[PDB]
Scaffold this active site. Sequence first.
Site, mmCIF file in Angstrom:
data_model
loop_
_atom_site.group_PDB
_atom_site.id
_atom_site.type_symbol
_atom_site.label_atom_id
_atom_site.label_comp_id
_atom_site.label_asym_id
_atom_site.label_seq_id
_atom_site.Cartn_x
_atom_site.Cartn_y
_atom_site.Cartn_z
ATOM 1 N N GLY A 1 16.627 85.037 -1.997
ATOM 2 C CA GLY A 1 17.505 84.907 -3.231
ATOM 3 C C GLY A 1 18.869 84.646 -2.808
ATOM 4 O O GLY A 1 19.177 84.770 -2.319
ATOM 5 N N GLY B 1 24.680 84.988 -7.897
ATOM 6 C CA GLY B 1 26.363 85.873 -8.166
ATOM 7 C C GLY B 1 26.951 86.505 -6.956
ATOM 8 O O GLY B 1 27.865 86.351 -6.557
ATOM 9 N N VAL C 1 20.663 85.877 0.238
ATOM 10 C CA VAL C 1 20.037 87.164 0.755
ATOM 11 C C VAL C 1 18.543 86.495 1.874
ATOM 12 O O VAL C 1 17.841 85.897 1.303
ATOM 13 C CB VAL C 1 19.213 88.111 -0.134
ATOM 14 C CG1 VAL C 1 18.674 89.450 0.819
ATOM 15 C CG2 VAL C 1 20.208 89.271 -1.073
ATOM 16 N N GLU D 1 17.929 97.384 5.272
ATOM 17 C CA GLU D 1 16.474 97.881 5.746
ATOM 18 C C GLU D 1 15.822 97.187 4.661
ATOM 19 O O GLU D 1 16.176 96.716 3.551
ATOM 20 C CB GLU D 1 16.591 99.505 5.645
ATOM 21 C CG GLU D 1 16.165 99.754 4.224
ATOM 22 C CD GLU D 1 16.055 101.688 3.552
ATOM 23 O OE1 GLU D 1 14.978 102.432 4.881
ATOM 24 O OE2 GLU D 1 17.295 102.006 3.050
ATOM 25 N N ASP E 1 25.945 98.647 -12.156
ATOM 26 C CA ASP E 1 24.990 97.124 -11.743
ATOM 27 C C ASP E 1 23.473 97.971 -12.359
ATOM 28 O O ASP E 1 22.586 97.596 -11.635
ATOM 29 C CB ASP E 1 25.469 96.155 -11.477
ATOM 30 C CG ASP E 1 25.050 95.030 -11.803
ATOM 31 O OD1 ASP E 1 24.691 94.745 -13.047
ATOM 32 O OD2 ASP E 1 24.738 93.898 -11.466
HETATM 33 N N1 LIG Z 1 14.370 87.916 -6.948
HETATM 34 C C1 LIG Z 1 13.797 88.369 -6.272
HETATM 35 C C2 LIG Z 1 14.546 89.265 -4.478
HETATM 36 N N2 LIG Z 1 15.678 89.572 -5.137
HETATM 37 C C3 LIG Z 1 17.020 89.446 -4.513
HETATM 38 O O1 LIG Z 1 17.206 88.454 -3.597
HETATM 39 C C4 LIG Z 1 18.220 90.037 -4.844
HETATM 40 C C5 LIG Z 1 19.360 90.716 -4.279
HETATM 41 C C6 LIG Z 1 20.543 90.975 -4.893
HETATM 42 N N3 LIG Z 1 21.581 91.529 -3.832
HETATM 43 C C7 LIG Z 1 21.302 92.488 -2.976
HETATM 44 O O2 LIG Z 1 22.126 93.227 -2.095
HETATM 45 C C8 LIG Z 1 19.908 92.466 -2.815
HETATM 46 C C9 LIG Z 1 19.352 93.140 -1.395
HETATM 47 C C10 LIG Z 1 18.452 92.423 -1.506
HETATM 48 C C11 LIG Z 1 17.221 93.192 -0.752
HETATM 49 C C12 LIG Z 1 17.261 94.500 0.058
HETATM 50 C C13 LIG Z 1 16.754 94.906 0.880
HETATM 51 N N4 LIG Z 1 15.076 94.756 1.413
HETATM 52 C C14 LIG Z 1 14.668 93.570 0.271
HETATM 53 F F1 LIG Z 1 13.822 92.529 0.410
HETATM 54 C C15 LIG Z 1 15.834 92.830 -0.234
HETATM 55 C C16 LIG Z 1 17.800 91.542 -3.045
HETATM 56 N N5 LIG Z 1 19.243 91.778 -2.940
HETATM 57 C C17 LIG Z 1 13.243 89.164 -3.724
HETATM 58 C C18 LIG Z 1 12.690 88.723 -2.973
HETATM 59 C C19 LIG Z 1 12.191 89.562 -2.069
HETATM 60 C C20 LIG Z 1 12.184 90.617 -2.044
HETATM 61 C C21 LIG Z 1 12.478 91.363 -2.389
HETATM 62 C C22 LIG Z 1 14.129 91.053 -3.183
#
Ligand SMILES: NC[C@@H](NC(=O)C[C@H]1CNC(=O)c2cc(-c3ccnc(F)c3)cn21)c1ccccc1
EC number: 2.7.11.1
Length: 273
Positions: free
Chosen positions: A13, A16, A20, A89, A135
Amino acid sequence: PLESQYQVGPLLGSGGFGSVYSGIRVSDNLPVAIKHVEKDRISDWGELPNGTRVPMEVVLLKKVSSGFSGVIRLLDWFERPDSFVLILERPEPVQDLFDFITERGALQEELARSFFWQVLEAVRHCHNCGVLHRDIKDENILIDLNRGELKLIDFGSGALLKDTVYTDFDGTRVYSPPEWIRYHRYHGRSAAVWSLGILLYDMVCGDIPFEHDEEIIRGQVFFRQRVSSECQHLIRWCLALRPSDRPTFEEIQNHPWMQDVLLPQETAEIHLH
Ligand SMILES: NC[C@@H](NC(=O)C[C@H]1CNC(=O)c2cc(-c3ccnc(F)c3)cn21)c1ccccc1
């Protein structure tokens, strides 16, 4: 040593908050997420025990780390010429709460109770560690689909918890309280309880209750789905216009609707598998 240590997978994703990516820790094959944030884009800076200038998210995530699995764990971080990289993680399999609700519609109350209870335990841990998230929303909650455990993510709008007024805010507006909208002033815990009311409505109705500033300020809640009287009562209490009319965290968890929560594993067996 960043590109040495991790195998980068697909983009998960961006927005703002930065970008990631999915990743794998090369040493032991641990699933990770790799978050990149541009230095220009960092609204809040902090400083480490040894006094190094880092994004506030790094300070905050270090303050919360321990055996507790309700908050996403920071594994490492790197500085680059124009950016910071955070290693988090990653649960597997996983889905954020926003996508889960989009696909399944409004959640059964039994399921919402389990999820909401876990979010409350995670937020209490943050506060107990001196950290305010600022948030809380469905997009910032991950569901570990095998174990039925939720994880709070993204502390990039957060701050050190304090008892005096905040006059800055860069979280999500439709989850922000009427006192922020009207006065540009809020206190930590009571603003958090408002966003928790927004979140609970979202879980049990499948959408957020307010879209416009005028709706937030009026604070009149309408239920579009069938929701129990006790759940309605808790939501309306969290969404009291006056901050001091909102329940404390203790009062939320002692509320009648919050009794007899499922354990995470029971929650996965019944609702997720
Ligand atoms: N739109 C869905 C997407 N969300 C984000 O990227 C939000 C992003 C916003 N800000 C962050 O700090 C952040 C950390 C993570 C994250 C953290 C740990 N494991 C994961 F799989 C994802 C994800 N986020 C997502 C896709 C697949 C698995 C998980 C999440």
